Subunit: 256 residues, 4 copies
Amino acid sequence: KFLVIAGPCAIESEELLLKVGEEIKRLSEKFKEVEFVFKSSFDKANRSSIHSFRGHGLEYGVKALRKVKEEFGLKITTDIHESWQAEPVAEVADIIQIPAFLCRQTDLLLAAAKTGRAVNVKKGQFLAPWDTKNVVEKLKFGGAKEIYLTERGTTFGYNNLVVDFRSLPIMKQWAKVIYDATHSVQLPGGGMREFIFPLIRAAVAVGCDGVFMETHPEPEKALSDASTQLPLSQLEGIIEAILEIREVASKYYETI
Amino acid sequence: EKFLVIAGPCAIESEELLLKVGEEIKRLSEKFKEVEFVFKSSFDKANRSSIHSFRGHGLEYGVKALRKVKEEFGLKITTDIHESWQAEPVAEVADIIQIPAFLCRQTDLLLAAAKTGRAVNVKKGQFLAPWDTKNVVEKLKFGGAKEIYLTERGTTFGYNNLVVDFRSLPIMKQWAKVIYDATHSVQLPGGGGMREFIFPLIRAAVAVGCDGVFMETHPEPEKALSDASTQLPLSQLEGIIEAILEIREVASKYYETI
Amino acid sequence: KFLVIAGPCAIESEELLLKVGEEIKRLSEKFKEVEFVFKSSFDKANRSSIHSFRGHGLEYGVKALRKVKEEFGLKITTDIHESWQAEPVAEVADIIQIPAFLCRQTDLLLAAAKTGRAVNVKKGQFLAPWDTKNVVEKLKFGGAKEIYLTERGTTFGYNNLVVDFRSLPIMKQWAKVIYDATHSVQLPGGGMREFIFPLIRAAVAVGCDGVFMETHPEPEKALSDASTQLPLSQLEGIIEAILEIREVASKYYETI
Amino acid sequence: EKFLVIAGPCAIESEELLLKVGEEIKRLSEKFKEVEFVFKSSFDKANRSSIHSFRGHGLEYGVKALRKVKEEFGLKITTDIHESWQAEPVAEVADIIQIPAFLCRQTDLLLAAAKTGRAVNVKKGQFLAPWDTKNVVEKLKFGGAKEIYLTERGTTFGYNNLVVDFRSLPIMKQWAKVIYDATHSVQLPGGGGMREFIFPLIRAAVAVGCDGVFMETHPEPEKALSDASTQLPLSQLEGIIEAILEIREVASKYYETI
Ligand SMILES: O=C(O)C(=O)C[C@@H](O)[C@@H](O)[C@H](O)[C@H](O)COP(=O)(O)O
Ligand SMILES: O=C(O)C(=O)C[C@@H](O)[C@@H](O)[C@H](O)[C@H](O)COP(=O)(O)O
Ligand SMILES: O=C(O)C(=O)C[C@@H](O)[C@@H](O)[C@H](O)[C@H](O)COP(=O)(O)O
Ligand SMILES: O=C(O)C(=O)C[C@@H](O)[C@@H](O)[C@H](O)[C@H](O)COP(=O)(O)O
Ligand SMILES: [Cu+2]
Ligand SMILES: [Cu+2]
Ligand SMILES: [Cu+2]
Ligand SMILES: [Cu+2]
C-alpha cells in the first residue's frame, strides 16, 4: 500500500497528538488502500537556538505515542538521536526514523536495525542520491529488513534547499522511497508553505512509495516548523489529490 | 489554455531531417487537437563548448528550411537568435523567437526580438533566480512584446550538473506563461543523467503546472550533431505527449491560482 | 609584470575617466614593476532593469578611452557585447574583455581574436574551471596570442557567488589568470565591500597573474556596481599590500 | 595570538603511529615556538560511508594512546566525540574536544562537551551558512564553554564536492576563534582535487586571516586507513608550517578589526 506518514512535528502535548490522531484515524477509514503511520518527535534535538522548543522527554513522548496507538490502532514512527534511544523507542515505534544530519552515524543506524523495527533514513542535505546505497547496506548488515529512504531536499547555497527529483528513481534501486513534503521547502537557519502541495504533486507524478507530511490544527501556533506544518483541515484534500494523480501517473512509473 | 508543445530536432542538420520530424509533429497535431504544436530547430549552435563541434549551415539556409516546414505542414515555427541583427530576418518565419539562456540578460537582444511583433520565449539563465525573471519580462514589455514565455531549463548545481527547482514554475507564472524544457534540464554541461530522467521530470512539471513543454526529438538521437545524449527518439514522442495530457488533466483541478 | 586592471565600472563621463586615470597614472609611476591597464565599460549591456544606467554609446566611450590613453599613456581595456563591436573597440583597447555571460559565444570570441589584440575572458558563473580549456582553444583558433581568463565567482544557490580558489591553479594550465576582486563578491539580482580586500589577499597568496579591481572617487554615487566599487583613495594601500604578500608567497607558487 | 596548528594522523591506527607522528610534532613545536601545537587523532571514525571501512580500536584504546602522546611529548591533545556519553571520558585527556561537522547542531553533544570545562572546537557543517554559527557559539556559552573555536571545512557544492567560501572566516570571527581545516575542505565526499589543492588553499586562509590551521598528516598517506587522499606526508609538515607563518606575518598588518 502507498504510505502516508503524518502527524504534528513535535509532541507538544498528549492532547495535541490525540486531536491529530483522531483525524488521521478518520482518514485511514476513508482511504483503505493507504497505509497511514502517525509521526511525532519526542525531541527536537537539533534546533538552531538553545532557547527553542525541544519537547517533554523521551518517556513522556513514548507514553503519548502509546496512547495514540492504543486509542486509534495506528502505526507509529518517531526519530532517534543517539543509539541508546533505539530500544525504548522500538517498544512503541513501528518505524524508527533517522534524522538527516545523522544519516551517516553508523552506530545510530545499527542500533535502530537491531530492534527489528522498520527503519526510515532521512537523506542528508549533504548526500548525493547514489551515496544512499551505502546507508542501506549498513542497515542490512545490522539486520534491518524493511528500509525506507526519505527525500528532504539538498543544500543549495545558503539557507535554501532544492529537491532534485532525479533522486527518486535513483534511490528506488535499493530502498522504498518516501517524499518529505514539509521539510523539503523549509528554508534552514524561495518559500515556503505555498510550495508544499505543488511539490508533493511532482513527487507522486515522478513516482514514490509514500509521502511524509506534518500537520497541526493551528500551524502558526506550532512550537517547531510552524512555517511548514499543514493545517489539519487541508490533509484530506491533499491525500485525495495524491491518490488521483498516482492512479493516472503510475502507468508510466519506470521499472526499478 | 491550449497547452503548448514545442518540439523538433535540436539543430538544422539538413532540410531533410526537418521534414521527417515535421511530418510526425504534423501527424501528432492532428491527433492531439487540444495542443498547440510549435516546431523548433536551431539554425546555429552559437555557444558550443568546442570550436570543433557542429554549429549549422547558416541563417539563410536555416530560415529557408524552417519556411519549408511551415509551408508543407502548416506548423508554427520557433528558433533562437544570438545577436540583435538576427531578429529581423528570423521574424520573417518564426512565430516565437527564442532567447538562449546565457543571453537572457542581454538587453539589446531582448529589445530586438520584442520590436518584431513576434512572441518571445526566454530560456531562464542557469545563473538566474526565478524571482529575477520579473525584470526580464519588464524589458520585453517595454520593447513591445505582447506574448511572452519563460522557459525553465535547470540551474547551476555545483560543476557540470543542473538541478530543476520546481518552485520556479509557480514563481515565474506570476509574470509570464511558463514552459518546461525537458531536454536541456537534465543535460550535464561541459561533460543523473541523462535520458533516463527526461520523462520523470516532465511528469513532475505537468503535475506542478505549466503552460507548455519543450522537447527535442530526432529519428536517431545517437547520430545527432548536437545534444545527442538528450534528444528523444521520434517514435517515443506520441506516448510522452499522451502521458503529459493525462497527468495535466488529473492534476489540473489542483493548480493554484496565480 | 604583475597586472593590475583598474578603473571605474562604467564610462559615466570623460571627466570621471580623467580623474580616475590621473590616480592610476600616479600609481603606475610609483609601482614600476606592475603593469597597469585602465578599464571602463562603454555599455552595461546586461543590467537587470530596463531603467538602469547603460552608458553614452560606443563612440563616446571609445573617444573618452582614447583621451585616457593619450593624456596618460596607459594601456586600455573595455568589454564587447556583440561581434561587430570588436573592430572599432580594438582601435583603442589593448585588451578586449569578454563578459562572463558571453564566454561561450564563439563568434564574439573569434571577433575579438581577429583584431590581433589581447583577449581577457571573464569565466561564466556557470562554467567549471576545467571547462575553460575549450575557451582558450577557440581564441587560439581565431589567432589570439595573449589570452587571460578571469575568475569572477560561481553560482552558489540564488543571488550569491562563491570563489572556488581551486580554479586559479587549474586555469593557469592554459592561460594567464586574473582575479576579479570587485564582481566576485557582488551578490547578483554574504556581502559585499567588506570582503573585497580579504579575498584579493587570498588570490595573491594562492597565485595569479594579476588583479582586476574597479574604483570610483565616490562609490555610493556610481551608476553601476556601486556596492562594490573601491574608493579611489584606498587603491594605493591595497596595491602595496598585494605586492608585499605576492613577494613572500610567490616562493610557494606551484609549477604549472 | 599564538597561532594554533592542530595536526596528527586522521585515525588512531595504532599507538605506534601516534608516537611516530608525535615525535615530529614535538620537534616542530621546539622550532616554531610562536605556534601552539595541538596533537589530533580520532579514536573512532563514526561516520564512514561504508560499513566495511576502518573505524578504529575503540574509545578506551584511543584515549590511552593519546594519553601516551601527551605524557611522552608534553603536547596538548584533541579528539572528536560522537555521542554525549563520550565527553566525560574523553575530557580526561583532551584539551580541546572536537565536534564533528554533521553533528554541529546536536544540542546534547555540544552541552556534554561544554560542561567538561575543556575547550570546544566545532567543525562547521557542510550544510551551515557562516552567519548561522552564531547560535552554535551561543549554545556552547550557555553550556559553560569559555574557549570556543569554529572550524571551516568546506560547504556542499552540488554532489560529491565541497567549496571553501573564504568569506566565512571574517564572518565567524565575530563570535569565535576560527580554524581552517586544510585536509577535509578539499576532500570529495562519497567519492579539484585533491591533495594538490591543500597547500594553495592554506595560503589563502592565512592571507585572509584565521586563528589556526588544522592539518592531518601520516608518514605514508597512501597506506592510511582513513582520508588517505588528503593526509599530508609527515616530511612536508615543516615546510608548510614555515610558509603559513611567513604569509601570516606579511598579511597581518592588513587583517581587519572584528
Ligand atoms: O522531525 C523530522 O521529521 C525532521 O525532519 C526534523 C526537523 O523537524 C528539524 O530538523 C527542524 O526542522 C529544525 O530543528 C528546526 O530548525 P530551527 O527552527 O531550530 O532553525
Ligand atoms: O537550442 C536550444 O533550445 C538550447 O537550449 C541551446 C542548446 O542546444 C545549447 O546550449 C547546447 O546544449 C550546447 O551548445 C551544447 O553544448 P556542448 O555539447 O557543445 O558542450
Ligand atoms: O564590466 C565588467 O567587468 C563586468 O564584470 C560586468 C558587470 O559590471 C555587470 O555584469 C554588472 O555587474 C551588472 O550589469 C549589474 O547588475 P544589476 O545591478 O543591473 O542587477
Ligand atoms: O576527524 C576529523 O577531523 C573529521 O573531519 C572527520 C572525517 O575524518 C570523516 O568525516 C571522514 O572524512 C569520513 O568518515 C571519510 O569518509 P569515507 O572515506 O568513509 O567516505
Ligand atoms: Cu518537522
Ligand atoms: Cu538542444
Ligand atoms: Cu563593474
Ligand atoms: Cu581526517
